[PDB]
Design a protein around this motif. Structure first.
Motif, PDB file in Angstrom:
ATOM      1  N   UNK A  59      44.241  38.443  35.665  1.00  0.00           N
ATOM      2  CA  UNK A  59      44.304  37.567  36.670  1.00  0.00           C
ATOM      3  C   UNK A  59      44.041  35.966  36.652  1.00  0.00           C
ATOM      4  N   UNK A  60      42.946  35.520  36.151  1.00  0.00           N
ATOM      5  CA  UNK A  60      42.381  34.390  35.837  1.00  0.00           C
ATOM      6  C   UNK A  60      43.227  33.629  34.489  1.00  0.00           C
ATOM      7  N   UNK A  61      43.728  34.734  33.542  1.00  0.00           N
ATOM      8  CA  UNK A  61      44.707  34.225  32.833  1.00  0.00           C
ATOM      9  C   UNK A  61      46.064  33.861  33.301  1.00  0.00           C
ATOM     10  N   UNK A  62      46.546  34.570  34.176  1.00  0.00           N
ATOM     11  CA  UNK A  62      47.747  34.103  35.071  1.00  0.00           C
ATOM     12  C   UNK A  62      47.596  32.787  35.719  1.00  0.00           C
ATOM     13  N   UNK A  74      49.168  29.486  35.592  1.00  0.00           N
ATOM     14  CA  UNK A  74      49.737  29.034  36.757  1.00  0.00           C
ATOM     15  C   UNK A  74      50.866  29.824  37.135  1.00  0.00           C
ATOM     16  N   UNK A  75      51.150  31.159  37.253  1.00  0.00           N
ATOM     17  CA  UNK A  75      52.143  31.825  37.528  1.00  0.00           C
ATOM     18  C   UNK A  75      51.636  32.996  38.561  1.00  0.00           C
ATOM     19  N   UNK A  76      52.555  33.689  39.235  1.00  0.00           N
ATOM     20  CA  UNK A  76      52.430  34.424  40.243  1.00  0.00           C
ATOM     21  C   UNK A  76      51.994  35.737  39.601  1.00  0.00           C
ATOM     22  N   UNK A  77      51.256  36.654  40.257  1.00  0.00           N
ATOM     23  CA  UNK A  77      50.864  37.826  39.853  1.00  0.00           C
ATOM     24  C   UNK A  77      51.492  38.954  40.525  1.00  0.00           C
ATOM     25  N   UNK A  78      52.086  38.792  41.714  1.00  0.00           N
ATOM     26  CA  UNK A  78      52.834  39.880  42.520  1.00  0.00           C
ATOM     27  C   UNK A  78      54.161  40.030  41.998  1.00  0.00           C
ATOM     28  N   UNK A  79      54.787  39.098  41.457  1.00  0.00           N
ATOM     29  CA  UNK A  79      56.013  39.101  40.724  1.00  0.00           C
ATOM     30  C   UNK A  79      55.869  39.342  39.167  1.00  0.00           C
ATOM     31  N   UNK A  80      54.657  40.069  38.649  1.00  0.00           N
ATOM     32  CA  UNK A  80      54.442  40.338  37.437  1.00  0.00           C
ATOM     33  C   UNK A  80      53.901  41.777  37.100  1.00  0.00           C
ATOM     34  N   UNK A  81      54.537  42.454  36.238  1.00  0.00           N
ATOM     35  CA  UNK A  81      54.280  43.690  35.946  1.00  0.00           C
ATOM     36  C   UNK A  81      53.127  44.033  35.209  1.00  0.00           C
ATOM     37  N   UNK A  82      51.798  43.658  35.448  1.00  0.00           N
ATOM     38  CA  UNK A  82      50.687  43.406  34.542  1.00  0.00           C
ATOM     39  C   UNK A  82      50.366  44.875  34.287  1.00  0.00           C
TER      40      UNK A  82
END
Lengths: 67, 48, 53, 96
Positions: D26-29, D33-41
């Motif tokens: 999370x803090x790495x994203x 500076x990029x979104x998490x909700x549109x990322x498949x972590x």
């Protein structure tokens, strides 16, 4: 089934995983024991001070009593 | 830190012998389990 | 045999490494905390926090 | 199916290595500076042609490898976003 060499790097990967785990847990144990020893010896020192002034309180109480 | 830094000339060689690799992997697993139970025991000793 | 022992060791080791990293509780493992203390004891530490090194 | 097993092992234990080397999403994203909700972590971050995740993990492993070298060369030249910046990053990667 995979051949013997791919199994060689499979087991090498497992060994490297175990070694990395061991090293990072060693470092975590080192910082943990440093913090634990420092804190525990500080509270042992204040334990000593508390019982010292406490012993002063007992001796004052018993002294005034048998006066 | 505590162990010697001599493992680099062991891991750079292409593995050839099955018995050696099995023994070394079993030793690494035993080391991990050993440090795991020691860290556990240190944790409950600190807690008590 | 050595083949069967090797395959069973491989299977049990991959099962072990699978089950170790399938939980969100490892942040305590990677960061062993030192806080079993209550809230009224920390000022006693902070009184002489720089007198031990 | 041997190659499929090899690349599945590689993907899963790359994730295992990344978790074992001190990764946190999370803090790495946020630092990226990029979104998490549109990322498949997780395990399937690289399901697509994933550039920014490769950037973040590469910078992470490089600053773990040598923080002094990191704050020597990427201190004044951290070109992370545009295409020419990506080309410079790839050139540095190739040299190292």
């Amino acid at each position: 089934s995979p051949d013997l060499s791919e199994a060689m790097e499979m087991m090498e990967s497992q060994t490297l995983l175990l070694t990395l785990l061991s090293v990072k847990m060693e470092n975590n144990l080192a910082e943990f024991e440093r913090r634990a020893e420092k804190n525990l010896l500080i509270m042992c020192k204040e334990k000593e001070k508390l019982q010292k002034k406490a012993h002063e309180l007992k001796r004052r109480l018993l002294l005034s009593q048998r006066k | 830190k505590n162990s010697s830094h001599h493992f680099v000339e062991t891991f750079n060689i292409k593995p050839q012998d099955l018995h050696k690799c099995i023994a070394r992997c079993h030793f690494a697993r035993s080391r991990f389990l050993q440090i795991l139970q020691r860290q556990d025991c240190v944790t409950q000793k600190y807690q008590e | 045999s050595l083949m069967e022992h090797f395959e069973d060791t491989r299977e049990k080791n991959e099962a072990l490494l699978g089950e170790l990293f399938s939980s969100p509780h490892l942040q305590m493992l990677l960061n062993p905390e030192c806080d079993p203390w209550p809230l009224d004891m920390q000022p006693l530490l902070n009184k002489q926090s720089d007198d031990w090194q | 199916m041997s190659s499929a097993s090899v690349t599945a092992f590689e993907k899963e234990h790359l994730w295992m290595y990344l978790q074992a080397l001190g990764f946190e999403p999370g803090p790495a994203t946020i630092a990226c500076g990029k979104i998490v909700s549109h990322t498949h972590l997780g395990v399937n971050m690289f399901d697509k042609l994933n550039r920014d995740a490769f950037h973040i993990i590469s910078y992470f492993l490089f600053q773990v490898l040598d923080q002094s070298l990191t704050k020597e060369v990427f201190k004044f030249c951290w070109p992370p976003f545009d295409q020419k910046s990506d080309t410079e990053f790839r050139k540095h990667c190739c040299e190292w």
